[PDB]
């Protein structure tokens, strides 16, 4: 009948994976998909049969990893755990292990590579009109969802090199870089990617004046659509192309206040393409 008081003595919703499981899944990290400024990308297959792309830090020792690195690592995982969109390269798990030093994030695998590759690499399979419209819409729906959630940090590197393509060429926008942009800037970037999808052309530097004058010639009324639109598309509907180029023009306006919101872009894009989510 008497008090006995004691005291105990000594963070997200996607699964933690053991390093041993990932070693098996990725053949001890021997199959490289690619690389970024902050990470290596490894191919694996989980015991379920689900194919994965594993983003792994370049850091090779706990001595080279700061408390800030750890904080940004957990922050990225927490924020991506709230995205599960058909047109996003979704986070499927993560692995932190100290021995040996491991900081990875496990993503959905996209078998058909990047949009940049398919648009610009000579040996890559070219995309037809409907494929390009599907990709364009998929991107817009992802970006709209991202903005709806209020998680734009995931789109800070958005361009054709960060959009991957599924087995039937649907878009998956990615965020593979370890976290270490206003929505008005993302809208502008969307317009540039849409222009790239339509024309097959991309700026060759930060100061591509010749490309600027060429695009300018179109918007000022001095270019036929046959000169603008990528010849590798094959046949295309003229008035649909016009309408999509108007979307581009709105998005890439030099005055950020004049650009549309991503929700408006997606609505307009659906009106034009008639492609639902």
Structure determined via: X-ray
Cα torsion angle, 118, 160, 240, 144, sign: positive
Read out DSSP for 185-251?
Answer: HHHHHHHHHHHHHHH----SSTT-HHHHHHHHHHHTT---HHHHS-GGG-S--HHHHHHHHHHHHHH
The strand ranges marked E within 77-119 are 91-97, 102-108
Q: Do 161 and 192 meet the contact criterion of CB atoms below 8 Å apart?
A: no
258, two tokens: 């004049």
261, two tokens: 């919101």
- CA 68 – CA 128 distance, rounded (Å): 45
Give CA torsion, residues 263, 266, 267, 269, to 10 deg.
160
Give residue limits of the domains in the chain. Answer: 1-277
- CA 198 – CA 51 distance, rounded (Å): 31
**Residue with the two structure tokens 């100290």:** 98
Question: 93 has which bridge partners?
Answer: 106
């Amino acid at each position: 009948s008497m008090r006995a008081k004691k005291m105990g003595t000594v963070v997200t919703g996607v699964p933690s994976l053991k390093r041993s499981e990932l070693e098996t899944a990725c053949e001890d990290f021997s199959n490289i998909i690619g690389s970024t400024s902050t990470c290596m990308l490894y191919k694996g297959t989980l015991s379920s049969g689900v194919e994965i792309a594993v983003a792994s830090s370049l850091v090779t020792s706990a001595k080279d990893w700061s408390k800030e690195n750890e904080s940004q690592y957990r922050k990225k995982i927490t924020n991506l755990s709230k995205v599960s969109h058909k047109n996003f390269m979704n986070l499927l798990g993560y692995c932190e292990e100290e021995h040996p030093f491991t900081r990875v994030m496990v993503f959905e695998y996209a078998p058909n590579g990047t949009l940049f590759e398919h648009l610009h690499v000579r040996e890559a399979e070219k995309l037809d009109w409907m494929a390009r419209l599907r990709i364009s819409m998929g991107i817009a729906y992802c970006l709209e969802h991202m903005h709806q959630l209020q998680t734009p940090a995931a789109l800070r590197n958005f361009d054709s090199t960060t959009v991957y393509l599924t087995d039937d060429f649907a878009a998956k926008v990615s965020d593979l870089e370890f976290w270490n942009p206003d929505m008005e800037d993302i809208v502008r970037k969307y317009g540039m990617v849409l222009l790239e999808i339509l024309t097959g052309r991309v700026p060759s530097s930060e100061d591509d004046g010749p490309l600027e004058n060429w695009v300018s010639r179109y918007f000022e009324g001095g270019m036929r659509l046959e000169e603008l639109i990528d010849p590798s598309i094959g046949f295309f509907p003229e008035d649909t192309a016009r309408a999509l180029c108007e979307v581009v023009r709105s998005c890439i306006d030099r005055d950020p206040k004049k650009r549309p919101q991503m929700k408006e872009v997606a609505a307009r894009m659906r009106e034009i393409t008639a492609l639902g989510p």
